[PDB]
Amino acid sequence: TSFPFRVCELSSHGDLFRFSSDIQCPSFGTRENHTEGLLMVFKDNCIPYSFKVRSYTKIVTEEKFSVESYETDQMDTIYQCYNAVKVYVDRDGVNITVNLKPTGGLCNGVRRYASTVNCLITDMMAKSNSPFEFFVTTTGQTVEMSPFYDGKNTETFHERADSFHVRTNYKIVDYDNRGTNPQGERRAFLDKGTYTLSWKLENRTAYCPLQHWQTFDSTIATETGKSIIFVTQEGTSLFVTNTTVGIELPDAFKCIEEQVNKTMHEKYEAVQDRYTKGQEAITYFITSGGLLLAWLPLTPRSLATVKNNPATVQIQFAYDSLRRQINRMLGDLARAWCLEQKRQNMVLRELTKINPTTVMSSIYGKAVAAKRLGDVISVSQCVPVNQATVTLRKSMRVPGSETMCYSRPLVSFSFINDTKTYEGQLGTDNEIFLTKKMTEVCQATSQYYFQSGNEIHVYNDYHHFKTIELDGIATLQTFISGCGNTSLICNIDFASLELYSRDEQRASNVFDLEGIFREYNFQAQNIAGLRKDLDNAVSN
Amino acid sequence: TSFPFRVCELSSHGDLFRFSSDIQCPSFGTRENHTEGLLMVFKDNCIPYSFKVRSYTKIVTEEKFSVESYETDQMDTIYQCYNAVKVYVDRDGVNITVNLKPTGGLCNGVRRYASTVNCLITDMMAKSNSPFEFFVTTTGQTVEMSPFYDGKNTETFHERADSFHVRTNYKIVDYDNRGTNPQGERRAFLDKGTYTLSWKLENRTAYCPLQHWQTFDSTIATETGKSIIFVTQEGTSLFVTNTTVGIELPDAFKCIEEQVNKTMHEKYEAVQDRYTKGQEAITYFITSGGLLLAWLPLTPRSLATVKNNPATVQIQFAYDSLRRQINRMLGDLARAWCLEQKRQNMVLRELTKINPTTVMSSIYGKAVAAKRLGDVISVSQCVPVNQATVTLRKSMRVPGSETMCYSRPLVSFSFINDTKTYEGQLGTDNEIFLTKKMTEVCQATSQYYFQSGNEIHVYNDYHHFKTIELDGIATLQTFISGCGNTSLICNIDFASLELYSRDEQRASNVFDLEGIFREYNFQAQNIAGLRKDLDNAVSN
Amino acid sequence: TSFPFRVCELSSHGDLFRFSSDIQCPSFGTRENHTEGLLMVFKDNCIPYSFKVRSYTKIVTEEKFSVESYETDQMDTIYQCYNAVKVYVDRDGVNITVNLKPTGGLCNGVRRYASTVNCLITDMMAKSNSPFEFFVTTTGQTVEMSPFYDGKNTETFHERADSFHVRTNYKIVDYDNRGTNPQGERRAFLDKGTYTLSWKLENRTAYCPLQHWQTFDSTIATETGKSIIFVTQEGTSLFVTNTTVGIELPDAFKCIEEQVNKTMHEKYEAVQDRYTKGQEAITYFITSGGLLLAWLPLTPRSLATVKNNPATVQIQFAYDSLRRQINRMLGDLARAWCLEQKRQNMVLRELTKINPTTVMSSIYGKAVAAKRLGDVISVSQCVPVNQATVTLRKSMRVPGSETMCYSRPLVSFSFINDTKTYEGQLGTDNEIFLTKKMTEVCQATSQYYFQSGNEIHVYNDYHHFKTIELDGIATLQTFISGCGNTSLICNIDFASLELYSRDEQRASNVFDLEGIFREYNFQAQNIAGLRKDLDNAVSN
Ligand SMILES: *[C@@H]1O[C@H](CO)[C@@H](O[C@@H]2O[C@H](CO)[C@@H](O[C@@H]3O[C@H](CO)[C@@H](O)[C@H](O)[C@@H]3O)[C@H](O)[C@H]2NC(C)=O)[C@H](O)[C@H]1NC(C)=O
Ligand SMILES: *[C@@H]1O[C@H](CO)[C@@H](O[C@@H]2O[C@H](CO)[C@@H](O[C@@H]3O[C@H](CO)[C@@H](O)[C@H](O)[C@@H]3O)[C@H](O)[C@H]2NC(C)=O)[C@H](O)[C@H]1NC(C)=O
Ligand SMILES: *[C@@H]1O[C@H](CO)[C@@H](O[C@@H]2O[C@H](CO)[C@@H](O[C@@H]3O[C@H](CO)[C@@H](O)[C@H](O)[C@@H]3O)[C@H](O)[C@H]2NC(C)=O)[C@H](O)[C@H]1NC(C)=O
């Protein structure tokens, strides 16, 4: 499955996105003078430059400290360091050669080494996007420079110039290959006060700013005076061009010119029997969002020459009268689609307040850890756990609490290549939470169904009863079409009714957010009462 | 109204459904070679087998106990039982013949009888679905067998075989008809340790696995190599068939063969003037979701024979050129509909976390109690209350709390055929909650509008002011189209501004979930402070 | 920007709307006998009658009191009042002529004047809707009469008749123009016990009940026996008419007759070459929602006379066979649109529980303060603050709390024309909250991005780091199409993992509503434990 057992709440800081307010959907206005043509849509290119980075730090018990040049050489060559922080030493000892032992990193390709005072090394990935303004490490620390900054190149670099240096012919030793003496590299070093950071300088690579996105074989152009609106039959996509006369192609985009000549020729060749070219040269357009649109206008051949009114006039009139009706309908579909995207954006913005992790995982169709960092959402991979160790606990009653029960089953698991066993609670879709705070007052009778991939675990009275296939429980569609529409069963929790008849004040488990809201002001007044009573108890 | 006054939170466990992750929407790919034809869609049949069940239990003050065979005979014939639990007796008395009195059940057809130790009988419905793997009683107790299990039949039965027995020629007495001596039955008995359960064994009924769902009079079949995609013009429904050559009909489904011969002949007869049959026999297809699709391919007659280019060629070209364009548009509409259903499923999954009862009631268009039982939603009827007794309290200030007021109006009501009067708070759409915890700090001025079906109750200063028709308040659409778009009124709560200017720390009522979220961490730190201060007060 | 810095939570009571349950979408049923025609849709007219109102009150320390006729004359002419409340006087003094000083109102055109006992005047707007049943003042106080009630006119008036009077030739003085002696007016007075209210009686204006809404140039009418369903090609709008024979126009709507004659003639004149009129007179229809629909049926000219089968018959058959297919598709699009609106209404109803302010602001596309007043939503303008004074605080660590940090940046601001400086927290989209309760436990490392219009503020370690343009962070669409689809970075919060490995019980910041829900029952049990421990501490 694409949603394996995973811990997602450990994900600190990943790729950022924001919800676009003020999405604008055009009004077609005067809607005659449609013209057909090929549209190639080009999107800004993003290259995920992922590169291996070594982090060096001193941990002190908790203040942290960078590592100087002489000690980082000893770390990279011998994995030895010097037990002190510049002054106290571990166990209040004396400054001595202290040897780093290896330690598991939880991601693919992350390796930690850790020997009061503690030397620490972390091999880890960092990723950067096409503009190369910054790169984010697995720790979530962000560095405000290009990873290709050579120092002399004056490429984007906002950190302290004194903190950055580059050393040639640098030697680095692989921990289990200490005698192989690997080939030398050119390696950069950065001092951030909290930690030293080092990475290999790969001479910056070269790429073309625009990557091809879509080819729409027939599109309808509507000239609304200030803008051209392009309506695409494939999908329902709509493009608003802010200029009426197409711009000559900027030379930086000239890598496109071959691709457009090829795609236009290949696709026009399959269409020659139905259309003639309106222009000998492609017209280029730029959208406000920065998409480049390549437009080849085509004029349809009259049906007489496709390779009291007389028949031909009636046929051409009917054909043109229905083509225009289809074009109007496609335009209204594109406008409806634009408005629906505008409303989806708001719906997603609101659902992200309920749970960003699940919202994003549903958008992607794969497990992604999502964290709301104020007004931006960060998306990242979850921490994988090795699924052979994942075992649910058969009983979910809280040990040593006659009045408390777990509302989610306990899970025992181990991190990949980690011997230590950890315990947590099974969230939704094999998610594992490093918490045991999902508890509820033990009901006299309870039925709970928890889905763990292709199997559902059925718990009666907080004890594991059976495992059933997912097909044992109808999906929403099958439910509404099947016996979900029949006379629903009438249920009475007679125990709850008697309890309310005998103690109207009694507390009960909340089951939904709206119940939290309905209780909230009463609970806040209860807290205020606690505060006042405690202050009076202290005063007396 | 379909949303009468009701108590929904008493609903323990009803019909279960789950939100289907990984809904797959196909890509049409190579899109020529459309063919038209009739499509009959058949869906798996669900029969709601609802049957009357008698429950027997001993309640002890609270341990519960089943009832033996000799005492259940005395209950079913005389409604007498024996006051003891096998040992203590009610009022620490002595084992004696003790007579059950009748008691109201709150659902249609539920009747309770109840005389430390308490004999209890409950006539109640149980419902089961077409696979007959289990049946759920009104209490919410689920039994893991088919209600048609004859013991010897080896039909699905997972309970303890020692606990189940069947007795012939069993006699049962109706409480108010004790002299009528009803005809005998064959009745099954089950011991679940907590309770005995009994029901009449109706010889298992017979039915055909597939129920007809839809007939689509014209559909477009696209052969995408591995699958056939069926696009239906009525609605926007889409069906993905995992096989390219249609399977011969399984004999178990042969009940369909007459229905398909009839529907295909009846509907082709109205279409003969436009199409000819491509095949002499219907082709059957099965979807991954288990729908059976009956497909009659049709080939359209040329327009010449429907009962420099020459005219006929132009007419046929235009007709075929526009039919293909409509077919492409219908395919894109079906794909858009599939994606929109995929996104609706996520939206509903998230809104169910806000409030499943209201979400489900809106989906059904009728009052349904919905409870999230972990990862599955249970849907059931709400408990009806007799609407002649429902009276709102004219004042919603909390009695004996100068600083507290009710945020929802109080409701006095009686359960159907119950003399006892109960008091609660009016939730949304005539829902009644068995709680009075929806309270708020009394505002100096307040306006609240509560809708109770076709009338809105307007409360000024926590006192009932007037009742207005629902038409007195514009709907969202009428609002946005009417004066909602004008210059909105500018309001200043000057009292709130002065309060904040004079006590920046002062507490205020929360009005929405996002305000709960914004306060939550501060309230948690307040609770932690309470805990630390109380521990220090105890230590001193 | 349309979302300036603003305080929205001060908005007490504005225009009300409700979510329409039981939106009905028709079934087309028998679908032949389409007919084309022009449809004019007329909607009920709403006029926002906004008028200037003066409020008079005595504030007492806090009981409030109206002002008598002799003292209101002295307020309106000299802005003098008499320091007493009928008896105690400010500073326990003696009844004396006491002079009102001016004070800023926070809305455009609101002016307050305020000299134990405090005379108070408030010039403020009040707005009323077309039916003139009530008008709402800026304070949020609602008055149950028409503002055009002349006393003798017996126009809608539900307040106490003794409380209302009208005085001719009334003189009112402008505070800074005390010598100009403005022209007299006819002014009404109302005593509400809490406050006196006064406004100018402008003889009620006259208007026509129906305002033109839309003209749909081609629409499809389907006669479903009981109703006519109108499907409009522009947009996807659908109208259900409850009558099959159109009603003769009520005389009250006769103002429409000229507009319809003009629009029908102007639009038919552009269509004569394609259609002939089916009737010589427009047919009027009324929807259940009260829309008036003007219908001119048109019959299309045969293609022969638009100004073995023979060609003309084939051409007409093809044209009619495709027009019917387009009409069926438009009908299915209109039904899908109706169902989608029905589902949007539920989605919006649920999202309003998360945050009505943001939901409504997204619907309007402009900043609107929204407050849920039970089952109705009130919408109003937010209080503007003068944006030249808005300065974010560079540091968001809580002063004097080593363990607490602010989760939203602090904002210093001044109200328009107010010298006083106020401090609060920056909510979403330049919203300012008069609170400082959004706090969190200081994380060892934190990254937060807050958007403030066209700029994003980036805070590292609770200290302001940089400001970036909105284009520095990809929108959701650009994200999903760009590097958001690449291999996401794998992040480990190693500190969190160590903390959980060493103290499984440790508390953590909640980041979403579902985390509130997961913690809620455990926090409620913690509160209950606090209560029990405090009661035992008091008992001992
Ligand atoms: C603990 O013992 C280590 C043993 O290495 C001491 O490290 C030494 O630290 C000094 C500076 O305090 C280094 O001096 C350096 O010399 C190089 C030139 O070789 C120069 O480029 C540097 O800027 C610096 O002046 C020295 O190299 C370094 N290592 C050795 C081999 O002595 C460390 O200072 C002792 N102190 C603590 C904090 O316990
Ligand atoms: C309280 O008084 C009742 C009076 O009925 C006692 O019920 C009796 O219980 C015994 C078993 O303790 C029953 O014996 C049974 O005999 C039948 C055959 O007739 C056999 O099939 C059963 O397996 C069982 O051996 C007895 O029938 C039953 N009723 C009578 C009429 O005596 C009850 O035991 C007394 N005890 C308590 C718990 O207070
Ligand atoms: C404080 O001093 C003011 C000074 O104005 C007193 O106001 C006076 O109040 C009396 C009623 O208590 C007013 O009598 C009124 O006479 C008019 C006719 O001129 C009549 O229409 C009213 O119904 C009422 O009978 C009087 O006009 C008013 N002003 C003057 C100039 O004396 C006030 O009563 C003193 N008392 C308090 C509460 O401190």
Looking at residue A62, what DSSP letter applies?
-
Residue C86 beta carbon below 6 angstroms from any ligand 3 atom: yes
Q: Is residue B80 one of the residues assigned to a domain?
A: yes
Strand partners, A463: A395, A460
Q: Does A16 touch chain C (CB under 8 A)?
A: yes
Residue A54: other Cβ atoms inside 10 A:
21
Q: Is residue C140 situated within a structural domain?
A: yes
DSSP bridge pairs for A243: none
Structure tokens at B413: 């009501």
* Residue C70: its H or E element: helix C69-78
Are A299 and A275 spatial neighbours (Cβ–Cβ below 8 Å)? Answer: yes
Q: How far is A437 from chain C (nearest CA, A)?
A: 6
Q: Which residues contact A489 (CB under 8 A, 6 or more apart)?
A: B14, B15, B125, B126, B127, B136, B138, B380, B381
Specify the long-range contacts of residues C417-424, CB closer than 8 Å, at least 24 apart. Answer: C417/C104, C417/C386, C418/C104, C418/C106, C420/B501, C421/C389, C422/B500, C422/B501, C423/B504, C424/C7
Domain holding A508, by residue range, is 496-539
Q: Give the contacts of A43 (CB within 8 A, at least 6 positions apart).
A: A210, A211, A212, A213, A291, C481, C482
- Helices C513-539 and B513-539: crossing angle in degrees, nearest 10, is 30
Which is nearest to A482 in space by CA: B51, B130, B360? B130
Instruction: Tell me, yes or no, if C111 comes closer than 8 A to chain B by beta carbon.
Output: no
**B413, containing H or E segment:** strand B410-414
Determine the residue type at A225: G
Go through C522-536 and write b for each residue having 16 or more CB atoms within 10 A of its CB, e for each that does not: bbbbbbeebeebbee
The answer to the question of residue A284 being in a domain is yes
| A401 plus A523 within the same structural domain | no
Structure tokens at B131: 């696979």
User: Which chain B residues touch C400 with a CB distance below 8 Å?
Assistant: none
Q: Is some CB atom of chain B closer than 8 A to the CB atom of C123?
A: no
How many CA atoms does the CB half-sphere of C184 hold within 13 Å?
A: 6
From chain A, the residues in CB contact with B207 under 8 A are: none
Q: B325: which 2 tokens?
A: 């364009």
Residue A373 lies in a domain: no
Nearest to C428, CA basis, from C355, C350, C322: C355
Asked if residues A240 and A224 have their Cβ atoms less than 8 Å apart, the reply is: no
Nearest residue to B48 (alpha-carbon basis) of B136, B115, B162? B136
Which residues 6+ apart lie within 8 Å of B224 measured at CB? B26, B27, B28, B29, B30
Question: How far is A470 from chain B, CA to nearest CA, in Å?
Answer: 9
Give the count of domains, chain C: 4
Q: Report the C-alpha gap between C20 and C17 in whole angstroms.
A: 9
Q: How far is A514 from chain C (nearest CA, A)?
A: 8
Pairing of strands B64-65, B49-60: antiparallel
Let me know whether A58 and A169 are in one domain. yes
> Which one, of B217, B208, B219, B221, lies nearest residue B42 by Cα?
B208
C327 and C438 share one domain? no
Q: Which amino acid is at A94?
A: V
Please name the helix (run of DSSP H) or strand (run of DSSP E) that holds residue A526, with its range, or none.
Answer: helix A513-539
Question: How many degrees, rounded to 5, is the angle at CA B387 between CA B386 and CA B393?
Answer: 120
C327 vs C36: CA distance, rounded Å: 10
Give the end-to-end CA distance of chain A in Å, rounded to a whole number: 62
Structural domain contains residue C1: no
Determine which residue's CA is closest to atom 9 belonging to ligand 2.
B70
Distance of CA A435 to the CA centre of its chain: 23
Q: Is any atom of ligand 3 closer than 6 Å to the C-beta of C279?
A: no
What the block records as the tokens of B391 is 């009276």
Q: Are residues A65 and A120 in the same domain?
A: yes
C298 and C342 part of one domain: yes
Query: For the residues of A211-239, what is the DSSP string, one character each?
Result: EEEEEEEEEEEEE-SS-EEEEESSTT-EE
Compute the distance from residue C158 Cα to the ligand 3 centre, in Å: 29
Helix spans in C355-467 (H): 356-364
Residues B30 and B60 in one domain: no
Q: Whose CA is nearest to atom 15 of ligand 2?
A: B70
Strand ranges for B155-280 from DSSP E: 164-170, 185-191, 196-200, 210-223, 228-232, 238-241, 275-277
Q: Coil, strand or helix: which one is A321?
A: helix
CA A287 – CA A243 distance, rounded (Å): 8
* Domain co-membership, A475 together with A528: no
Site residues for ligand 2, CB cut-off 6 Å: B 70, 82, 84, 86-87, 95
Whether C148 lines ligand 3, by a CB cut-off of 6 Å, is no
CA B116/CA B60 separation, integer angstroms: 5
Phi-psi region of B181 (alpha: psi -120 to 50; beta: other; left: phi over 0): left
Indicate left, alpha or beta for C357 from its phi (over 0: left) and psi (-120 to 50: alpha): alpha
Let me know if residue A369 belongs to a domain.
no
Cα separation, A232 vs A220, in Å, equals 7
**Taking each helix axis from N to C terminus, what angle separates A311-354 and C356-364, rounded to the nearest 10 degrees?**
160
Distance CA B382, CA B364 (A): 13
Query: Is residue C487 within 8 angstroms of chain A, CB to CB?
Result: yes
Task: Mention every residue, 6+ apart, whose C-beta is less than 8 A from residue C511.
Answer: A371, A372
Interface of C with B in 277-336 (CB under 8 A): 289, 308-309, 311, 314-315, 317-318, 321-322, 325-326, 328-329, 332-333, 336
Question: For residues A211 and A45, is the Cβ–Cβ distance under 8 A?
Answer: yes
Question: Are A341 and C475 spatial neighbours (Cβ–Cβ below 8 Å)?
Answer: no
- Residue reference for tokens 């488990």: A509
Asked if residue A108 belongs to a domain, the reply is yes
CA A462 to chain centre: 35
Question: Any idea what DSSP says for residue A106?
Answer: S
Residue with tokens 């340790």: B193
The Cα angle at residue A415 between residues A414 and A416, in degrees rounded to 5: 115
Contact C391, C377 (CB under 8 A): no
Which residues in chain A are immediately followed by a break of C to N over 2.5 Å? 61, 86, 115, 307
Question: What is the C-alpha separation between A332 and A340, in angstroms, rounded?
Answer: 12
Say how far apart CA C530 and CA C533 lie, in whole Å.
5
Subunits in contact with chain C (3 or more CB pairs closer than 8 Å) = A, B
Q: At what angle do helices C311-354 and B311-354 cross, to 10 degrees?
A: 10
CA atoms within 13 A on the CB side of C116: 11
Is the CB of A488 less than 8 angstroms away from the CB of B383? no
Q: CATH number of the domain at B304, please.
A: 2.30.29.100
Residue in C closest to A346 by C-alpha: C362
- B355 close contact with A: CB closer than 8 A: yes
Q: What residues does C380 pair with on adjacent strands?
A: C369
User: Does residue B453 come out as left (phi exceeding 0), alpha (psi in the -120 to 50 range) or beta?
Assistant: left
- Token pair of C214 as six digits: 């839309």
Residue C94 Cβ inside 6 Å of ligand 3? The answer reads no
CB count, 10 Å around CB of C183?
A: 8
How big is chain A, counted in residues? Answer: 540
Same domain (yes/no): B193, B324:
no
Q: Which residues of chain A does C486 touch, with a Cβ-Cβ cutoff of 8 Å?
A: 46, 48
Give the phi and the psi of residue B36 in degrees, each rounded to 5. -90, 155
Distance CA B310, CA B320 (A): 16
The neighbours of chain B, by the rule of 3 or more Cβ pairs under 8 Å, are A, C
Element (H, E) at A363: helix A356-364
Q: State the smallest CA–CA distance between residue C377 and chain B in angstroms.
A: 9
H or E stretch including C349? helix C311-354
Q: What is the CATH number of the domain that holds C421?
A: 2.30.30.1230
Of the candidates A329, A354, A436, the beta carbon closest to that of C513 is on A354
Residues found in chain C = 540
Looking at the structure, tell me whether residues A245 and A183 fall in a common domain: no
Neighbours of chain A (3+ CB pairs under 8 A): B, C
Q: Are residues A66 and A192 in the same domain?
A: yes
Distance CA C215, CA C293 (A): 10
- B180 Cα–ligand 1 center, Å: 107
Pair C137, C216 in one domain: no
CA distance B73 to A282: 93
**Between chains, do A483 and B141 touch, taking CB under 8 Å as contact?**
no
- Shared domain for A316 and A406, answered yes or no, is no
Listed in sequence order, the residues at least 6 apart from B526 whose beta carbon sits closer than 8 Å to its beta carbon are: A527, A531
Question: How far away is chain A from the Cα of B179, in angstroms, using its nearest Cα?
Answer: 31
Q: Copy the structure tokens of residue B361.
A: 């009631």
Using the structure block, give the residue that is written with the tokens 């050559």. B245
C513 touches chain A (CB under 8 A): yes
Identify the residue whose C-alpha is closest to ligand 1 atom 37.
A84
3-state secondary structure of C162: helix
Put simply, the answer to whether B306 touches C308 (Cβ < 8 Å) is no
Within a domain: residue C367?
no
> Environment class of residue B297 by beta-carbon count within 10 Å: exposed (0-12), middle (13-18) or buried (19+)?
middle
Contact call for residues C139 and B494 (beta carbons, < 8 A): yes
CA distance B8 to B21: 28
Q: Whose CA is nearest to atom 17 of ligand 1?
A: A70
Segment B502-508 long-range contacts (CB within 8 Å, at least 24 positions apart): B504/C423, B504/C436, B507/A524, B507/A528, B507/B441, B508/B441, B508/C435
C79 close to C121: Cβ distance less than 8 angstroms:
yes
